[PDB]
Design a protein around this ligand. Structure first.
Ligand SMILES: [Ca+2]
Ligand SMILES: [Ca+2]
Length: 308
């Protein structure tokens, strides 16, 4: 129990050390390093605060693990302060009662799992190397990420993750899933409404075996790799109405190289405005358009995660 471990440590005058997820290299990687040392918040700042001026979007600043798609889920959690209070119990602080131990709750399949941690964090020049607040006295987000890394087995296990999967872990909800090649007749409008509503949308290509995991296709797509759906629209192309979809690769910047890709002749073909209407520019940002018909042929699954 968390309350019991805190009580034990407190009555013994010591700070908690998590034997299940210790302050060592195995908790960070399965291969690696850059000069870091593990420190508790009270040893890097003088008055460490757990939650400072609210738990909000300004407290979520990427560290050396990256601008993960997982960050988008934590961002959306702060917009649901009721859900945030389930993931992050408010019985906790660096004040009287502190004993170097925190806990977080993640929905797993039919249960909220309590995940317990010690507050030792990877550190550089007395400063957090991974997730951190813009307020360097504030530690909830740093600690949330450590707890999620633990559920997942390591910090390294976090890169490449789905924001959808994390949002499921954070709320107890379930994303709806659709098969692109067996999709409803109004699939376009369904996706359009979900986007307008503020839902998280993801798309994937199925692997037929472990062999296919992170396999790149000749069209510049990657199998068993999480992507995000960010736009859907229509254009006039050579006198026809073409449905388009906008996809973001959130882990690296490999892009689609077929029709409607960044440098493709479709973009040159289409009316002068319409290129600006759809806000298109050719950049190696991991983001791109495809024809919605090519989308359905090349991707296998869509996941829609409605935020209430
Ligand atoms: Ca804050
Ligand atoms: Ca691009």
């Amino acid at each position: 129990s968390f309350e019991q471990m805190r009580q034990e440590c407190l009555q013994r005058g010591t700070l908690f050390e998590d034997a299940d997820f210790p302050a060592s290299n195995s908790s960070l990687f399965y291969s690696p390093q850059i000069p870091f040392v593990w420190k508790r918040p009270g040893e890097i700042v003088k008055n460490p605060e757990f939650i400072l001026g609210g738990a909000t979007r300004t407290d979520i600043c990427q560290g050396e693990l990256g601008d993960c798609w997982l960050l988008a889920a934590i961002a959306s959690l702060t917009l649901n302060q009721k859900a945030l209070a389930r993931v992050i119990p408010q019985d906790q602080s660096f004040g009287p009662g502190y004993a170097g131990i925190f806990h977080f709750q993640f929905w797993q399949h039919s249960e909220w799992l309590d995940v317990v941690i010690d507050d030792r964090l990877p550190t550089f020049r007395d400063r957090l190397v991974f997730l951190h607040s813009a307020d360097h006295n504030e530690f909830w987000s740093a600690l949330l990420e450590k707890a999620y890394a633990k559920l997942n087995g390591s910090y390294e296990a976090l890169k490449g993750g789905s924001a959808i999967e994390a949002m499921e872990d954070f709320t107890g909800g379930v994303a709806e899933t659709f098969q692109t090649k067996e999709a409803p007749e109004n699939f376009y409008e369904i996706l359009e409404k979900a986007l307008k509503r503020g839902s998280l949308l993801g798309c994937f290509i199925d692997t037929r075996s472990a062999a296919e995991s992170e396999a790149r296709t000749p069209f510049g797509l990657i199998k068993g790799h999480a992507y995000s759906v960010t736009g859907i629209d229509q254009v006039s192309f050579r006198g026809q109405r073409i449905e388009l979809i906008r996809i973001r690769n959130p882990w690296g910047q490999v892009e689609w190289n077929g029709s409607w890709s960044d440098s493709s002749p479709e973009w040159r073909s289409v009316g002068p405005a319409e290129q600006k209407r759809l806000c298109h520019t050719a950049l190696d940002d991991g983001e791109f358009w495809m024809a919605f018909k090519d989308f359905k042929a090349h991707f296998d699954k869509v996941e829609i995660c409605n935020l209430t």
